[PDB]
Amino acid sequence: DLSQCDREPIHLLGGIQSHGVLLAFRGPDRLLEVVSANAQALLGRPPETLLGQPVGRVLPAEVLAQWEPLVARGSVRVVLPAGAYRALLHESDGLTVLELEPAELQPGMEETALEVVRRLVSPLAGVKGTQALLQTAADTVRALTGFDRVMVYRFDADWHGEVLAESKRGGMDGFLGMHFPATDIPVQARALYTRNPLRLIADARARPVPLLPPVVPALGRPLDLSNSALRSVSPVHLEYLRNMGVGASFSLSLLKEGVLWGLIACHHLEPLHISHERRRACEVLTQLLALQLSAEERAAEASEDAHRAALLGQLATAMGEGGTLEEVLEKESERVLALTGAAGVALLLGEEPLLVGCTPAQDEVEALVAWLATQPFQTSFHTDRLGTVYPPLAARADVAAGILAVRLAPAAARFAIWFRPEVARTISWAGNPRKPAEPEPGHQRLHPRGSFQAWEETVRDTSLPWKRADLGAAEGFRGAL
Ligand SMILES: *C/C=C1/C(=C/C2=NC(=C\c3[nH]c(/C=C4\NC(=O)C(C=C)=C4C)c(C)c3CCC(=O)O)/C(CCC(=O)O)=C2C)NC(=O)[C@H]1C
């Protein structure tokens, strides 16, 4: 893809985090084929002397005693000499991958998790605005994880993102309202996070534990750790966290109607391990947030649609109550503009344009019509940045940053064209987005930026986006004209 940031194969880095152990077994005899270099931590023996051995001769008696439920369920609690561990199974590269990580220590964890689930599934939760929904999600995730800072991060259209809501302990700094470059979470990371919706970095300073051997022998490349809970993350990102002053990180993908909408990101100033089952409990909260957002967004759409139908009905009542069509539209200007949330409208009903509200002058409208008549757009054309595709009005963002035009005839140049002014947006970037990384000379290593301090810019010449209800209202108004 675009940048070198996009090319690092983060699922093939060949390392795991030091708090866990990984063992990959092959074939009917379950012969050990890949093992983490720290595996004496739970095997009692030097791991390289166990490659090739069958599983019953490798694993502790305690784990073997749980093999049946492990195989059947893919996840069991095992009590080892080192303490309680969560054992996890998944498949990768034709191997059965066993991961062990420290298990949840609080017996009441799930009871606590059900309580915070209540806050987010409540009778009419999200009734103070979706902002209160986002805040509740940040608060409950922080309560359940104990992380110092929890942020709701939304991806915008160009895949840069912004923090919409933040929950943090007293005294902490935060990132509320700040924007971050798309390269902060590159394309292959976004792809992985769409398929694997949870990731924990327990200690941003710890060194990775390598796998032995360093390739899957049948493949000649490292074991695919795409679905591994212990996967050590990109070194560049660990440097990013260090530059942020973050010692531990945990994030959850927000998947809303199938697409990666954002993340809930958690930061801790010191190392912090969250158990597998506590992370899965937090995943319920994030799934609930996504459901609540969808329910409220669709509710808003349905309400907006009803308002547009009502406007069309009120205009039909106004019509035929006397006067020509032109007289009615002039008198009902406010309703005609509200159909599409516009500031002005031009009607070309056969002669010169009828200009209602704030529009460009007659000359500029007539020139725009002659251009629209050449364009390919079936029945409706819309843009929120007219100046990029129609230079004659590019300096006129005071009245025509956005347009929504509908055809009123097959071949003839008869249109209704609604206009919108620009909405300037002053945004704070977390660091200078003109320097989103610090590459070494030669451009072969790359480091993250050193500074996340606010850097201000104002986005101009773009209107509010045209909503689905705006487009439907315009289609429905065509029949009246
Ligand atoms: C040239 C490449 C760069 C780069 C690579 C990179 N970042 C990755 C993971 C990642 N980044 C973020 C970003 C944020 N964390 C926050 O708190 C905020 C806003 C407040 C942002 C924008 C996150 C959340 C993550 C996921 C991991 C986590 O900590 O939760 C990855 C993938 C790491 C992996 O192996 O999974 C890569 C490759 N970051 C850059 O800045 C440039 C230099």
Side-chain angles (χ1 to χ4, degrees):
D1 289 85
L2 274 168
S3 42
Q4 324 153 87
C5 295
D6 299 330
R7 317 220 270 260
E8 184 189 18
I10 58 178
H11 64 302
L12 307 173
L13 303 181
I16 65 154
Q17 302 181 39
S18 53
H19 59 266
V21 174
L22 183 150
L23 294 99
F25 303 91
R26 175 158 306 255
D29 286 321
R30 314 244 208 185
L31 306 187
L32 186 69
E33 188 160 300
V34 187
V35 66
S36 54
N38 68 343
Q40 200 186 260
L42 284 314
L43 293 176
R45 264 214 185 104
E48 58 275 11
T49 65
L50 298 177
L51 283 171
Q53 295 310 304
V55 64
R57 303 189 48 273
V58 165
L59 291 182
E62 296 100 330
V63 186
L64 294 177
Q66 301 289 344
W67 196 246
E68 264 196 26
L70 183 58
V71 169
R73 311 143 71 147
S75 175
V76 287
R77 216 177 151 92
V78 302
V79 184
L80 303 179
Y85 277 71
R86 169 62 60 173
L88 312 165
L89 282 191
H90 73 283
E91 316 294 331
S92 175
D93 294 329
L95 296 162
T96 296
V97 184
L98 168 64
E99 295 182 297
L100 297 162
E101 81 177 290
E104 175 60 44
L105 299 164
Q106 300 293 339
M109 184 278 286
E110 285 89 349
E111 178 180 358
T112 296
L114 261 195
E115 261 309 289
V116 282
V117 167
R118 286 184 178 99
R119 294 180 49 184
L120 209 49
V121 84
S122 80
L124 300 151
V127 292
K128 313 88 184 152
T130 59
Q131 186 62 35
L133 259 181
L134 306 167
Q135 187 68 45
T136 295
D139 290 349
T140 54
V141 167
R142 184 163 77 88
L144 189 56
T145 61
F147 268 72
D148 289 327
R149 176 171 62 216
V150 175
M151 304 150 291
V152 180
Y153 184 76
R154 179 187 79 204
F155 293 112
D156 294 332
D158 55 8
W159 291 108
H160 103 272
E162 62 186 279
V163 174
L164 292 184
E166 190 168 63
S167 186
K168 64 193 159 59
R169 59 164 188 71
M172 286 285 293
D173 276 30
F175 294 106
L176 180 63
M178 305 186 75
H179 295 239
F180 295 70
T183 46
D184 283 22
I185 312 173
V187 71
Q188 82 284 38
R190 300 197 300 270
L192 182 57
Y193 299 169
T194 301
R195 311 159 44 216
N196 181 351
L198 306 185
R199 63 221 58 100
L200 169 67
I201 301 162
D203 182 351
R205 304 289 274 248
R207 309 307 308 166
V209 172
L211 299 182
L212 324 170
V215 290
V216 173
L219 306 179
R221 67 152 164 80
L223 176 67
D224 186 345
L225 291 178
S226 288
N227 294 126
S228 165
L230 298 182
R231 186 183 59 88
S232 191
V233 301
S234 154
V236 185
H237 180 59
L238 294 175
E239 197 178 353
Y240 178 106
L241 293 178
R242 294 194 284 261
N243 288 359
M244 263 187 183
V246 170
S249 192
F250 169 51
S251 57
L252 307 93
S253 305
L254 284 159
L255 299 160
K256 197 155 83 58
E257 310 130 23
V259 71
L260 185 65
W261 182 91
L263 306 171
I264 294 181
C266 316
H267 292 165
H268 211 60
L269 297 188
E270 307 173 340
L272 175 59
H273 175 257
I274 296 312
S275 76
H276 176 85
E277 290 304 277
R278 191 172 293 262
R279 300 194 304 267
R280 287 178 76 220
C282 292
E283 187 186 13
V284 174
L285 293 179
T286 65
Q287 288 184 104
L288 178 47
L289 173 63
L291 180 54
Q292 285 277 19
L293 293 172
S294 290
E296 293 291 319
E297 279 182 26
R298 295 306 184 171
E301 288 175 5
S303 295
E304 283 309 297
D305 293 350
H307 274 289
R308 303 309 193 282
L311 284 170
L312 296 172
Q314 290 163 12
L315 288 168
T317 297
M319 294 157 175
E321 231 164 37
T324 65
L325 173 87
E326 285 82 0
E327 282 171 272
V328 174
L329 303 174
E330 183 181 56
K331 169 172 186 143
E332 295 295 345
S333 51
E334 183 172 9
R335 285 183 165 95
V336 177
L337 301 186
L339 281 173
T340 62
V345 69
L347 292 324
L348 285 93
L349 313 172
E351 49 137 345
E352 294 92 25
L354 179 70
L355 302 173
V356 172
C358 300
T359 68
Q362 179 180 183
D363 271 340
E364 288 154 334
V365 173
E366 293 173 349
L368 177 61
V369 168
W371 178 82
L372 281 170
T374 71
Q375 295 314 294
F377 61 78
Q378 43 284 306
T379 66
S380 67
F381 173 98
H382 69 274
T383 180
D384 62 349
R385 60 205 81 204
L386 183 58
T388 58
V389 300
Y390 184 64
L393 285 177
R396 293 312 311 285
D398 62 318
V399 302
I403 66 173
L404 196 194
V406 290
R407 287 194 196 274
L408 303 178
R414 305 291 187 267
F415 299 96
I417 313 169
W418 285 271
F419 298 91
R420 279 182 186 174
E422 64 166 334
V423 174
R425 289 163 256 287
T426 291
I427 58 170
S428 300
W429 294 90
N432 184 344
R434 300 168 176 168
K435 180 63 170 172
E438 296 186 347
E440 299 191 3
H443 304 262
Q444 85 273 44
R445 286 242 174 168
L446 249 189
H447 301 270
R449 66 187 174 280
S451 180
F452 297 90
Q453 301 299 297
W455 189 100
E456 172 165 308
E457 89 165 300
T458 296
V459 177
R460 307 288 307 256
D461 306 315
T462 312
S463 65
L464 296 180
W466 298 97
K467 300 194 286 214
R468 161 196 155 289
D470 298 326
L471 307 165
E475 285 293 341
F477 199 47
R478 291 174 60 235
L481 306 179

